[PDB]
């Protein structure tokens, strides 16, 4: 199975704003880099408590909750990405993406 997944065409959704950037999943966690501002966010695998897959304004999106109460939303996936994302979360993050 894949040890990394990369999405170069998704967006972080913050209060209705859509910030383009690059999302990279590895066995250790998730990194998002905002293309405009260069701002990098990191989520460690062990910090994830919940992952949700749902329809959003552009395609589908992930909504991720961490143990410290932070919420991260990444939007603009094709629906066909669900299987690889679901498998990655289950295998490496030991979490089952909830479909809502």
From Swiss-Prot:
Domain of life where this protein originates: Eukaryota
N-acetylalanine: modified positions: 2
Localization terms from the record: Nucleus; Nucleus, Nucleolus; Chromosome
Linked residues for Glycyl lysine isopeptide (Lys-Gly) (interchain with G-Cter in SUMO2): 90
UniProt modification remark: Phosphorylated by CK2 following UV but not gamma irradiation. Phosphorylation inhibits its DNA-binding activity. Ubiquitinated. Polyubiquitinated following caspase cleavage resulting in degradation of the N-terminal ubiquitinated part of the cleaved protein.
Domain notes: The HMG box DNA-binding domain mediates DNA-binding. It has both affinity and specificity for DNA damaged globally with cisplatin.
Biological role stated in the UniProt entry: Component of the FACT complex, a general chromatin factor that acts to reorganize nucleosomes. The FACT complex is involved in multiple processes that require DNA as a template such as mRNA elongation, DNA replication and DNA repair. During transcription elongation the FACT complex acts as a histone chaperone that both destabilizes and restores nucleosomal structure.
Homology family: Belongs to the SSRP1 family.
Note: Autoantibodies against SSRP1 are present in sera from patients with systemic lupus erythematosus, but not other rheumatic diseases.
Record's subunit section: Interacts with MYOG (via C-terminal region). Component of the FACT complex, a stable heterodimer of SSRP1 and SUPT16H. Also a component of a CK2-SPT16-SSRP1 complex which forms following UV irradiation, composed of SSRP1, SUPT16H, CSNK2A1, CSNK2A2 and CSNK2B. Binds to histone H3-H4 tetramers, but not to intact nucleosomes. Identified in a centromere complex containing histones H2A, H2B and H4, and at least CENPA, CENPB, CENPC, CENPT, CENPN, HJURP, SUPT16H, SSRP1 and RSF1. Interacts with isoform gamma of TP63. Interacts with FYTTD1/UIF. Interacts with SRF. Interacts with NEK9. (Microbial infection) Interacts with Herpes simplex virus 1 (HHV-1) protein ICP22; this interaction relocalizes the FACT complex to viral genomes in infected cells.
Protein name according to UniProt: FACT complex subunit SSRP1
Range covered out of full length: 1 to 100 of 709
């Amino acid at each position: 199975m894949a040890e990394t997944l990369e999405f170069n065409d998704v967006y972080q959704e913050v209060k209705g704003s859509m910030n383009d950037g690059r999302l990279r999943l590895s066995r250790q966690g998730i990194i998002f880099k905002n293309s405009k501002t260069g701002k990098v966010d990191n989520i460690q695998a062990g910090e994830l408590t919940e992952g949700i897959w749902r329809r959003v304004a552009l395609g589908h999106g992930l909504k991720l909750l961490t143990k410290n109460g932070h919420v991260y939303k990444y939007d603009g996936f094709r629906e066909s990405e669900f299987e690889k994302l679901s498998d990655f979360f289950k295998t490496h993050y030991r979490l089952e993406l909830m479909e809502k």
